[PDB]
Design a protein around this ligand. Structure first.
Ligand code: P9J
Length: 249
């Protein structure tokens, strides 16, 4: 099932930078709408990332869940790698957060639920996921989030757990705690001005809450941001948390 750049029509650029941009696209024969992610080869071999792509791709091609961005295929040419992706038309949770400043209790619980499901589903298939940033969280036609990064296996400090910065399975839970906080306060709990300092804050687990944060949210966030992995809830217990069930559509 060889795809080629001539089976598509490329349209408006959707987002940019680094390895290469993402263009909106439609397959000529069927008229299917989707996303083309373009990546210059040479420029990725020279960052030594070449190989991890093939694996995250292999991993993704067999992944199917309504809160995980679909990967339909890929192909290469002389110079370039192209990924054929599901298209999510409401943009990123990141840009939504910039627009609204901060989400409300209802939207947060909803997203955390949709993510928790997508991560339960992942674990069953012995797939485990690294850090999760809002940059990599897209929204579908019905406003539902989709995990859109290529970071699996069988986050410029902010989203990384203490395990990955000092010396699995529980990394996910830490991720939900960071995202859950950021949703309600509008910036991640360990944001600092330098790498050096963010590293100290995460390593020691230094955060405080603004005064608008209801006790229920404090209680969930504090359970998930524990230095020791084994003290973190299982995904299940997060799905059934008093504050979650009360607020999650
Ligand atoms: C992979 C994918 C993207 C997408 N839709 C979009 N992606 N990205 C984006 C942001 C940063 C970097 C790359 C793309 C967008 O800003 C965006 C904005 C409005 C509507 C849709 C999208 N659907 N599927």
């Amino acid at each position: 099932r060889q795809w080629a750049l001539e089976d598509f029509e490329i349209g408006r650029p959707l987002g940019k930078g680094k390895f290469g941009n993402v263009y909106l696209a439609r397959e000529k024969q069927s008229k299917f709408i989707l996303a083309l992610k373009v990546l210059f080869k040479a420029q990725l071999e020279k960052a030594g990332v070449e190989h991890q792509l093939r694996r995250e791709v292999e991993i993704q091609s067999h992944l199917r869940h309504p809160n995980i961005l679909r990967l339909y295929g890929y192909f290469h040419d002389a110079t370039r790698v192209y990924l054929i992706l599901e298209y999510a038309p409401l943009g990123t949770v990141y840009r939504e957060l910039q627009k609204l400043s901060k989400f409300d209790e209802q939207r947060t619980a909803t997203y955390i639920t949709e993510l928790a499901n997508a991560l339960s589903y992942c674990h069953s298939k012995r797939v485990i996921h690294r850090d999760i940033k809002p940059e990599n969280l897209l929204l579908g036609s019905a406003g539902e989030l989709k995990i859109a990064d290529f970071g699996w296996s069988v986050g410029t400090l902010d989203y990384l757990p203490p395990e990955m910065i000092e010396g699995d399975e529980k990394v996910d839970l830490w991720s939900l705690g960071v995202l859950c906080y950021e949703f309600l306060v509008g910036k991640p709990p360990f944001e600092a001005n330098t790498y050096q300092e963010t590293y100290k804050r995460i390593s020691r687990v230094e955060f405080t809450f603004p005064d608008f944060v209801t006790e229920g949210a404090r209680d969930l966030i504090s359970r998930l941001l524990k230095h020791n992995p084994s003290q973190r809830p299982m995904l299940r217990e997060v799905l059934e948390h008093p504050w979650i069930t009360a607020n999650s559509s």
